[PDB]
Ligand binder design. Structure first.
Ligand SMILES: Nc1nc2c(ncn2[C@@H]2O[C@H](COP(=O)(O)OP(=O)(O)O)[C@@H](O)[C@H]2O)c(=O)[nH]1
Ligand SMILES: [Mg+2]
Length: 169
C-alpha cells in the first residue's frame, strides 16, 4: 500500500529564508549563505498525524523567467508555504501578490497554503508584529505560524500544518 505524496511549493521574496527552512526540514542544519538563485526540489518521508507520507517540496528562487519545472510545480502544487520575514514589512507586503499568483495559476478561489513569518529569532529587528501576521492569515482564512530556521522553531510544524490543510481540502 503506497503512501500519499504531497507536492508543496515554498514561495516568498528573496532573503526571507525559503532555502534555510527547507534545508532545516530535510537536513536538520542551518545554512547561512545559500545561493539565492538555486531552485531545488526535495523529498522527505514523514509521518503526519500518524499517517506516513512523502513530501515533494520545490524551494523556489529568484524571479527570472521560470524553468518548465517551476511552472509545472506552480500548476500541480497541492499546498503553498508563503514565507515572509518578521524583520521586513516589504516581504509581508509581497505576500499579497504571491497569493494572487498562486490562485491565478491554480485557477481556484482557495488553495491550501500557510502564512509563515520566518526569522522569529530576530526580535530586535522585528518590523511585522505577530498580530499583523495573524491578521493577514485570518483575512485570507489560512493558517499562520512564526518560524525560525536559525533556532529551529516550528520548522516541521509549518510543513506538517500545510499537509493538514491539504487533507482538509
Ligand atoms: N536570524 C535568522 N536568519 C535567517 C533565518 N532563516 C534564514 N536566515 C538568513 O537569511 C538569509 C537568507 O536565507 P535564505 O534561506 O537563502 O532565503 P531565501 O532567498 O528565501 O532562500 C541567510 O543568510 C540566512 O542565514 C532565521 O530563521 N533566522
Ligand atoms: Mg533560496
Amino acid at each position: 500500500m503506497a503512501m500519499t505524496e504531497y507536492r508543496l511549493v515554498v514561495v516568498g521574496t528573496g532573503g526571507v529564508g525559503k532555502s534555510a527552512l527547507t534545508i532545516q526540514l530535510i537536513q536538520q542544519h542551518f545554512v547561512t549563505e545559500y545561493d539565492p538563485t538555486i531552485e531545488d526540489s526535495y523529498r522527505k518521508h514523514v509521518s503526519i498525524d500518524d499517517e506516513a507520507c512523502l513530501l515533494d517540496i520545490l524551494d523556489t528562487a529568484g524571479q527570472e523567467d521560470y524553468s518548465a519545472m517551476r511552472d509545472q510545480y506552480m500548476r500541480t502544487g497541492e499546498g503553498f508555504l508563503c514565507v515572509y520575514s518578521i524583520d521586513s514589512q516589504q516581504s509581508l507586503d509581497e505576500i499579497h501578490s504571491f497569493r494572487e499568483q498562486i490562485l491565478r495559476v491554480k485557477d481556484q478561489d482557495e488553495v491550501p497554503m500557510i502564512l509563515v513569518g520566518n526569522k522569529c529569532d530576530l526580535e530586535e529587528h522585528r518590523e511585522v508584529s505577530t498580530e499583523a501576521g495573524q491578521a493577514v492569515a485570518k483575512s485570507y482564512s489560512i493558517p499562520f505560524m512564526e518560524t525560525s530556521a536559525k533556532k529551529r522553531i516550528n520548522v516541521e510544524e509549518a510543513f506538517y500544518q500545510l499537509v493538514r490543510e491539504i487533507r482538509k481540502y
